[PDB]
Amino acid sequence: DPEVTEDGTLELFIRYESKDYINVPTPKVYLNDWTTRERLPIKYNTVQRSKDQLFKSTLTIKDTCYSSSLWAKSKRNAEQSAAMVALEIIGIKTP
Ligand SMILES: [Cl-]
């Protein structure tokens, strides 16, 4: 049951842990493979905020937006966490 923001973005509080994906495909890879098979448009729109220099990414798949509600220490972490939100909400099986 994701949180829904005012503009309709679907969010979950997710931190990306790179240690869980050492030498294996990352969440962005799984999500990209799925959107490629479905021919779905996918884009990441990432921002860094001035107050603490953390990052947040809004991933759009077709006309649906997903993002992590946890601001991340890096651009990569914000994008990977947003991909994990999309994977978990859509229900895409990952290892
Ligand atoms: Cl982080």
PDB file of C-alpha atoms and ligand atoms in Angstrom:
ATOM      1  CA  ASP A   1       0.000   0.000   0.000  1.00  0.00           C
ATOM      2  CA  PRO A   2       2.162   2.852  -1.301  1.00  0.00           C
ATOM      3  CA  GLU A   3       1.868   6.466  -0.197  1.00  0.00           C
ATOM      4  CA  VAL A   4       0.378   8.716  -2.943  1.00  0.00           C
ATOM      5  CA  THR A   5       1.687  12.323  -3.145  1.00  0.00           C
ATOM      6  CA  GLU A   6      -0.465  15.343  -4.207  1.00  0.00           C
ATOM      7  CA  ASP A   7       0.600  14.985  -7.899  1.00  0.00           C
ATOM      8  CA  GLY A   8      -0.134  11.239  -7.871  1.00  0.00           C
ATOM      9  CA  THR A   9       3.426   9.924  -7.423  1.00  0.00           C
ATOM     10  CA  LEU A  10       3.545   6.447  -5.796  1.00  0.00           C
ATOM     11  CA  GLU A  11       6.093   6.214  -3.019  1.00  0.00           C
ATOM     12  CA  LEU A  12       7.633   3.735  -0.579  1.00  0.00           C
ATOM     13  CA  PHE A  13      10.320   4.536   2.011  1.00  0.00           C
ATOM     14  CA  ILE A  14      13.253   2.657   0.453  1.00  0.00           C
ATOM     15  CA  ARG A  15      17.021   2.905   0.972  1.00  0.00           C
ATOM     16  CA  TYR A  16      19.156   1.343  -1.770  1.00  0.00           C
ATOM     17  CA  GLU A  17      21.878  -0.888  -0.299  1.00  0.00           C
ATOM     18  CA  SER A  18      24.556  -1.433  -2.960  1.00  0.00           C
ATOM     19  CA  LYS A  19      26.049  -4.312  -0.904  1.00  0.00           C
ATOM     20  CA  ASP A  20      22.981  -6.417  -1.734  1.00  0.00           C
ATOM     21  CA  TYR A  21      23.719  -6.146  -5.502  1.00  0.00           C
ATOM     22  CA  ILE A  22      27.483  -6.787  -5.725  1.00  0.00           C
ATOM     23  CA  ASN A  23      28.331  -8.238  -9.166  1.00  0.00           C
ATOM     24  CA  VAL A  24      24.633  -9.001  -9.878  1.00  0.00           C
ATOM     25  CA  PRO A  25      21.990  -6.983 -11.818  1.00  0.00           C
ATOM     26  CA  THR A  26      20.741  -3.951  -9.886  1.00  0.00           C
ATOM     27  CA  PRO A  27      17.096  -2.885  -9.497  1.00  0.00           C
ATOM     28  CA  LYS A  28      17.475  -0.381 -12.438  1.00  0.00           C
ATOM     29  CA  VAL A  29      18.632  -3.261 -14.670  1.00  0.00           C
ATOM     30  CA  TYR A  30      15.621  -5.467 -13.756  1.00  0.00           C
ATOM     31  CA  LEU A  31      13.188  -2.602 -14.250  1.00  0.00           C
ATOM     32  CA  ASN A  32      14.770  -1.579 -17.575  1.00  0.00           C
ATOM     33  CA  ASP A  33      14.586  -5.230 -18.769  1.00  0.00           C
ATOM     34  CA  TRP A  34      10.871  -5.337 -17.902  1.00  0.00           C
ATOM     35  CA  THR A  35      10.012  -1.975 -19.568  1.00  0.00           C
ATOM     36  CA  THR A  36      12.073  -3.018 -22.647  1.00  0.00           C
ATOM     37  CA  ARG A  37      10.066  -6.264 -22.955  1.00  0.00           C
ATOM     38  CA  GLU A  38       6.811  -4.283 -22.638  1.00  0.00           C
ATOM     39  CA  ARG A  39       7.978  -1.375 -24.922  1.00  0.00           C
ATOM     40  CA  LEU A  40       7.106   1.079 -22.123  1.00  0.00           C
ATOM     41  CA  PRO A  41       8.535   4.585 -21.955  1.00  0.00           C
ATOM     42  CA  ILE A  42      10.756   5.040 -18.902  1.00  0.00           C
ATOM     43  CA  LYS A  43      12.595   8.116 -17.624  1.00  0.00           C
ATOM     44  CA  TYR A  44      14.314   9.201 -14.454  1.00  0.00           C
ATOM     45  CA  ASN A  45      14.086  12.825 -13.255  1.00  0.00           C
ATOM     46  CA  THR A  46      16.568  13.300 -10.427  1.00  0.00           C
ATOM     47  CA  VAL A  47      17.138  16.337  -8.261  1.00  0.00           C
ATOM     48  CA  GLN A  48      19.591  17.305  -5.541  1.00  0.00           C
ATOM     49  CA  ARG A  49      18.272  19.613  -2.821  1.00  0.00           C
ATOM     50  CA  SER A  50      20.338  22.524  -1.500  1.00  0.00           C
ATOM     51  CA  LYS A  51      19.585  22.216   2.257  1.00  0.00           C
ATOM     52  CA  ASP A  52      21.506  18.944   2.822  1.00  0.00           C
ATOM     53  CA  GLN A  53      22.625  17.953  -0.722  1.00  0.00           C
ATOM     54  CA  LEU A  54      20.554  14.729  -0.711  1.00  0.00           C
ATOM     55  CA  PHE A  55      18.892  13.349  -3.881  1.00  0.00           C
ATOM     56  CA  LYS A  56      15.412  12.181  -4.957  1.00  0.00           C
ATOM     57  CA  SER A  57      14.417  10.633  -8.291  1.00  0.00           C
ATOM     58  CA  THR A  58      10.968  10.458  -9.862  1.00  0.00           C
ATOM     59  CA  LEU A  59      10.784   7.587 -12.300  1.00  0.00           C
ATOM     60  CA  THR A  60       8.011   7.750 -14.898  1.00  0.00           C
ATOM     61  CA  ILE A  61       6.865   4.547 -16.598  1.00  0.00           C
ATOM     62  CA  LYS A  62       4.299   5.421 -19.285  1.00  0.00           C
ATOM     63  CA  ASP A  63       1.998   7.875 -17.329  1.00  0.00           C
ATOM     64  CA  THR A  64       2.737   6.594 -13.760  1.00  0.00           C
ATOM     65  CA  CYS A  65       5.333   8.101 -11.421  1.00  0.00           C
ATOM     66  CA  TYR A  66       7.256   6.346  -8.669  1.00  0.00           C
ATOM     67  CA  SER A  67       9.796   7.612  -6.164  1.00  0.00           C
ATOM     68  CA  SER A  68      11.391   6.719  -2.824  1.00  0.00           C
ATOM     69  CA  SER A  69      10.215   8.900   0.064  1.00  0.00           C
ATOM     70  CA  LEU A  70      13.762   8.616   1.543  1.00  0.00           C
ATOM     71  CA  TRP A  71      16.131  11.332   0.260  1.00  0.00           C
ATOM     72  CA  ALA A  72      19.414   9.564  -0.706  1.00  0.00           C
ATOM     73  CA  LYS A  73      23.153  10.275  -0.355  1.00  0.00           C
ATOM     74  CA  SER A  74      23.756   9.914  -4.108  1.00  0.00           C
ATOM     75  CA  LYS A  75      22.138  10.263  -7.564  1.00  0.00           C
ATOM     76  CA  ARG A  76      22.665   6.487  -8.110  1.00  0.00           C
ATOM     77  CA  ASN A  77      21.007   5.606  -4.758  1.00  0.00           C
ATOM     78  CA  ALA A  78      18.004   7.888  -5.450  1.00  0.00           C
ATOM     79  CA  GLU A  79      17.512   6.293  -8.916  1.00  0.00           C
ATOM     80  CA  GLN A  80      18.027   2.693  -7.708  1.00  0.00           C
ATOM     81  CA  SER A  81      15.613   3.255  -4.727  1.00  0.00           C
ATOM     82  CA  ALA A  82      12.980   4.702  -7.142  1.00  0.00           C
ATOM     83  CA  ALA A  83      13.417   1.583  -9.375  1.00  0.00           C
ATOM     84  CA  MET A  84      12.891  -0.649  -6.231  1.00  0.00           C
ATOM     85  CA  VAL A  85       9.663   1.317  -5.489  1.00  0.00           C
ATOM     86  CA  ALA A  86       8.393   0.644  -9.019  1.00  0.00           C
ATOM     87  CA  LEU A  87       9.436  -3.048  -8.878  1.00  0.00           C
ATOM     88  CA  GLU A  88       7.700  -3.593  -5.502  1.00  0.00           C
ATOM     89  CA  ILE A  89       4.477  -1.728  -6.457  1.00  0.00           C
ATOM     90  CA  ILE A  90       4.181  -3.334  -9.930  1.00  0.00           C
ATOM     91  CA  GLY A  91       5.089  -6.745  -8.358  1.00  0.00           C
ATOM     92  CA  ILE A  92       8.029  -7.632 -10.629  1.00  0.00           C
ATOM     93  CA  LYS A  93       9.893 -10.749  -9.348  1.00  0.00           C
ATOM     94  CA  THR A  94      13.551 -10.027  -8.580  1.00  0.00           C
ATOM     95  CA  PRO A  95      16.455 -11.996  -6.985  1.00  0.00           C
TER      96      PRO A  95
HETATM   97 CL    CL B   1      21.191   6.662   0.676  1.00  0.00          CL
END
